[PDB]
Amino acid sequence: NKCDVVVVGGGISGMAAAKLLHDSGLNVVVLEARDRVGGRTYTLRNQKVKYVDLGGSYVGPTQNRILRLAKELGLETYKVNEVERLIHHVKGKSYPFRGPFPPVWNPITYLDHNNFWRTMDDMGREIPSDAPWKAPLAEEWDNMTMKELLDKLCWTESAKQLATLFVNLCVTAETHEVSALWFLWYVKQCGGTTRIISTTNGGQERKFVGGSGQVSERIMDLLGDRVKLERPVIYIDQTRENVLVETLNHEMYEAKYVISAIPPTLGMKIHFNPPLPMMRNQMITRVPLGSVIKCIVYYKEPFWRKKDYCGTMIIDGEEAPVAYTLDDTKPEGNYAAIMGFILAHKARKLARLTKEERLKKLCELYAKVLGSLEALEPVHYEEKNWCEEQYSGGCYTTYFPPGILTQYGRVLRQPVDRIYFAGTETATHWSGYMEGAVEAGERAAREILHAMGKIPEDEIWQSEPESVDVPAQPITTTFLERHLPSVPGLLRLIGLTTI
Amino acid sequence: NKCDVVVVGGGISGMAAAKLLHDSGLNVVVLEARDRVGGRTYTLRNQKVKYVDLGGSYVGPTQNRILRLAKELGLETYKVNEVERLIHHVKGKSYPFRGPFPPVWNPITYLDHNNFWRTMDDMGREIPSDAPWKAPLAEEWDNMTMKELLDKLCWTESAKQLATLFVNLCVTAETHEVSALWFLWYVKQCGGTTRIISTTNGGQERKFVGGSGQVSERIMDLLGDRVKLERPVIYIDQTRENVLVETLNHEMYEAKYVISAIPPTLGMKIHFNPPLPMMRNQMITRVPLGSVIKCIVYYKEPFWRKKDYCGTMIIDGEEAPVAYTLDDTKPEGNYAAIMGFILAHKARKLARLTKEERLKKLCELYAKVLGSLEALEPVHYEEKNWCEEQYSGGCYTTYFPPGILTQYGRVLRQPVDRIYFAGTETATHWSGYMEGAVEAGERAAREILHAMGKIPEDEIWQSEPESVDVPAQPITTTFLERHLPSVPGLLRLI
Ligand SMILES: *Cc1cc2c(cc1C)nc1c(=O)[nH]c(=O)nc-1n2C[C@H](O)[C@H](O)[C@H](O)COP(=O)(O)OP(=O)(O)OC[C@H]1O[C@@H](n2cnc3c(N)ncnc32)[C@H](O)[C@@H]1O
Ligand SMILES: *Cc1cc2c(cc1C)nc1c(=O)[nH]c(=O)nc-1n2C[C@H](O)[C@H](O)[C@H](O)COP(=O)(O)OP(=O)(O)OC[C@H]1O[C@@H](n2cnc3c(N)ncnc32)[C@H](O)[C@@H]1O
Ligand SMILES: O=Cc1cc(=O)oc2cc(OCc3cccc(Cl)c3)ccc12
């Protein structure tokens, strides 16, 4: 029954909030809908795989809150394999390379590719991380999809195809589904295009030894029986002196404050008394999650490394079930594996198949991309379709369709009386990631500490010291990258010399 | 506890289904979240207005099922006032007109406007009513917003501004929010642009004497104690012999079958066991409802009639709170009033104001458009902001953002085990309206009758005889409307 704060949701955000609150001396309870903690992180263990992350997995430089939280829990990271060459597979052929971006040789195409990435970042710098709706052209940008933006910007099909794969991979949604403003904010708040797509020096640099699901489990250990499993919240009543939170299995909890640490749309699964204010009531029906199947095929050895491929494949084409892969081999070099994502519409289309049918398509694709018959001999397969999860709604995160962020975005983390809002969707730095979950959980716990009169207002938002274990190389550009014209810029230059 | 069918929701659709099954001899229960029936219909009564519809109100020709149902309940309709001239207010001046569409005088603008309305209807002819995802260009049209379509189509700002108002009024959403495929389907399954926008011989022809809220009320009267108010469903368990339906107030119902008669996205408020299949699980997070404030300003007399204006106003531009009005005067000529809609982003923007502030902005606008100081002296005001309703989500109806219809649309009315889907969103003719609520409720009730072996499969979908009281006249076009070129068509001749 009685405590100081009820946290709804026991993913990384809810658990980080509850930890911070418990450490400050408050009585907290965490109500978790599932028979497990971790939410969109989930570490499967069995004898065949040892452990494997089926949800959120990668961490990297500039993600200093999840690194510090995980380090304090006694966790360690290891580097994702990028020793050998990456592959870009396009129009049925593979092209090995080094560096974060596939190289482009054709000079006109090079200008178009260079201008594409440069412009994403140019536009992003006009967008405040904490208030994207305050960008000067916020309305214009929000009223366009990413497909429309790409249509205006990309003068070559080569750039437009790569850019489409970029969007599908970043937000598990089609370019026609998402707001240009939202997507430009999303990339910028992770530190830009280079940071977001990079393995070395970027978001996919590292994984946690033993799995990311340990973060949530270890905090559950510290909190003990304050974590209540299989307590889906159905009802929040704020009409009396203390808040009442009711669960599906018939229990009632009384609290001074509530943290909602669930994806924004899952807020719909709760009946509110009094009803939510209008802006929030409608916002929660306008913010879906993307569609992805995360698939892991195991092999006897990491045979790709022998042909000088690191296991990274960027695979363009409608026939390809998987558009992106990484080496998922253990740091000890055993349980050789390839992780791949089935993205957006393909997750919907391929969900119709059996597990065995999907394994077969993946192996056939990998054999072709890697030019290797060994890829047709899996020893094991694990997969997870996040579209089927009642208590997630999708993965990795919430996307904004056109027109939504400028109209409703300002209420995302606005308190509703004594309900405060956590979850990765409400973060301002790596929103959508385990990193943003930690930022949002800890910020919402501090909003409650400030309301209780325990901390001053200036301590609600707190900087994080850089990790000493995972240093961040700065993002740099060359002089030519900076000053080379776009395609229409060069055309304008030609019309000027000719006139 | 125990019955044959539990219907979740007591709006028109859920009540229609329950009535059909009751009349068949089955034992029905209706679980309704609110302290009232009607849902997105709501008739307020007080001495100042007598009665007023603050949600769904209008009915018209080709809406035969709502007309039959209401007649059986003892209801009568009357005609919305369209005797005098309509007004199109553009660039700060009023231009009175007759006929459904505002006239265009510039020859280039004329061609552009003509082409727009014509093209909406041509594109709709390729969209099947019962399967819009089967349109030959479904993906291409689904992957574009209506804003993109209008930018391509409309060569003048005049046409683009009227087209925009059209979208905003029809679906209470912005052009950039909505799929082109879904919008074009929506228009097509109402019978086309003329039918949808017309008062005479269209959707706004008539209203119910005493209010549309009487439809649900009178069915509730007929169902006895089978309707349970303040029973929001929170849980549906299908793992056993009988379906188990649990309510927020701790009650438990057991039935052979369930009809879900609530907006698709409101299905999010129910915890399901076993979980819903993947496609429906994601579909119900992808389908918002629009945003509207319905506002009624009352006057001593319908003074506009003295100036040969009927009270219909089509008001262009960003600055105007209301883009569209109709005369809301009672048949007897008393309780004079103007009904107006504050639409889409204006509902969001103006909601922060007080009721009295919105009243003043409305009266000043109507004074300017009607050219009458009489509009400045209202006797009463009523309004309803539908965006604030927990158990509606919005009004009038669900819209589909780009990409959604083709990817998810086929699961909208696919049964989940022993759960069948009603609600106006599931209709194939006047979906979004009271008419479509009836169609979908009665169809869902018959799917279950068929599941019980009571009727054959060919009796699940049933045609409706035309109303004798509200007969439909055909929509016609002229030779020039059909054959005049578009702007780029005239350019190609030059
Ligand atoms: C799914 C996924 C995610 C993911 C990704 C790949 C996939 C396939 N890769 C990532 C990566 O490599 N690196 C990274 O940093 N993030 C990655 N992502 C996203 C990441 O997993 C998420 O950003 C993060 O896990 C989100 O955390 P958050 O704490 O904000 O949210 P949650 O995990 O969804 O947890 C919410 C909890 O709430 C419970 N719930 C839901 N409804 C209720 C009710 N009504 N009552 C009580 N509890 C409720 C959920 O069960 C959950 O535990
Ligand atoms: C709001 C509105 C609607 C409207 C319109 C103008 C406005 C401002 N103009 C219309 C018009 O002139 N002519 C017309 O035919 N339609 C017009 N519309 C739309 C029309 O009202 C709707 O299409 C129709 O009313 C929809 O009926 P339906 O029965 O399909 O849906 P509903 O009214 O929303 O009823 C659903 C009921 O379900 C209850 N509910 C919701 N959740 C639960 C749970 N969990 N448990 C139990 N009950 C639940 C609702 O409270 C509601 O009663
Ligand atoms: O955003 C999340 C994310 C999770 C992930 O596992 O891999 C990514 C890989 C990305 O980029 C890989 C890449 C490299 C070169 C070109 C292109 Cl288009 C993409 C971008 C985001 C991600």
Ligand SMILES: O=Cc1cc(=O)oc2cc(OCc3cccc(Cl)c3)ccc12
């Ligand atoms: O769709 C619902 C709807 C409810 C209504 O009350 O009035 C309408 C009026 C409409 O058209 C009026 C109109 C006339 C002439 C031009 C334009 Cl753009 C609009 C269209 C839909 C509606």
